[PDB]
Amino acid sequence: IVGGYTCGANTVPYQVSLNSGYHFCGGSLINSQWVVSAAHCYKSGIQVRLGEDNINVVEGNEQFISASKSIVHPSYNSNTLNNDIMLIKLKSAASLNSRVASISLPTSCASAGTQCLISGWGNTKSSGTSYPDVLKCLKAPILSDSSCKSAYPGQITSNMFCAGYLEGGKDSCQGDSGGPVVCSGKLQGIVSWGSGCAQKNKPGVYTKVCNYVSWIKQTIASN
Numbered sequence: 001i002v003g004g005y006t007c008g009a010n011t012v013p014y015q016v017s018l019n020s021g022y023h024f025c026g027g028s029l030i031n032s033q034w035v036v037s038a039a040h041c042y043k044s045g046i047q048v049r050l051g052e053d054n055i056n057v058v059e060g061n062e063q064f065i066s067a068s069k070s071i072v073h074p075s076y077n078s079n080t081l082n083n084d085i086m087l088i089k090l091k092s093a094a095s096l097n098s099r100v101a102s103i104s105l106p107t108s109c110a111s112a113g114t115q116c117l118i119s120g121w122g123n124t125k126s127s128g129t130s131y132p133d134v135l136k137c138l139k140a141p142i143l144s145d146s147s148c149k150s151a152y153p154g155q156i157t158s159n160m161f162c163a164g165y166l167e168g169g170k171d172s173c174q175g176d177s178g179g180p181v182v183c184s185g186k187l188q189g190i191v192s193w194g195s196g197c198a199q200k201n202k203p204g205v206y207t208k209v210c211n212y213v214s215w216i217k218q219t220i221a222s223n
């Protein structure tokens with residue numbers, strides 16, 4: 001997260017860190033046994049870390065659970081990142097409480113102007129790499145479709161939305177992929193891609209979760 005602030009330990013209780021011997025992506029806990037992340041974060045050997053704040057130190061509240069299976073959306077396209085969503089089922093259910101809690105899926109899509117909270121342990125520099133130890137937060141608004149499409153002509157599908165600042169300086173970045181975009185207490189986006197990080201006129205692009213709620217419910221129900 002570039003231009004963000006330290007969230008404070010366990011203030012974002014649905015945030016998870018996907019770890020394969022190091023933190024590589026974020027995710028959101030939606031029920032005690034399922035996490036939603038981005039299909040481009042897929043890999044085998046995933047350990048889901050819940051109740052985390054400092055990813056390099058065990059300080060208490062952490063729950064490390066291995067993933068039993070990861071389900072990448074069947075229509076995920078790695079070249080366009082269309083349908084960039086993945087569900088991970090945990091080997092055992094997490095103990096939910098106030099430091100570890102799930103986030104609700106939306107009943108409707110959010111409109112431009114909605115203010116949302118994006119969080120993660122991704123890069124905090126737009127030029128160079130600086131990865132934090134603790135969770136960073138950023139409040140960003142969803143942009144209108146014309147500004148999004150004008151920023152990335154021909155690369156935005158109806159399963160994507162832009163959120164951020166066209167003036168630059170504040171944005172999600174590498175390491176934040178797979179993490180949550182929560183607006184009015186509902187999970188509306190998944191950090192997906194962007195051109196560089198916090199560059200002027202190049203906002204972040206997020207998977208539009210309201211278009212996958214029926215798929216998420218049907219898939220969890222049959223697995």
Ligand SMILES: NC(=[NH2+])c1ccc2[nH]c(-c3cc(OC(F)(F)F)ccc3[O-])nc2c1
Pocket residue numbers: 171172173174175176177191192193194195196197198203204205
């Ligand atoms: N500007 C943004 N809002 C943004 C958000 C997530 C990103 N994730 C990545 C990303 C970049 C990668 O390429 C690299 F390893 F060469 F840097 C790899 C994975 C990513 O998720 N870039 C990103 C940019």
Ligand SMILES: [Ca+2]
Pocket residue numbers: 052053054055056057058059060062
């Ligand atoms: Ca820790």
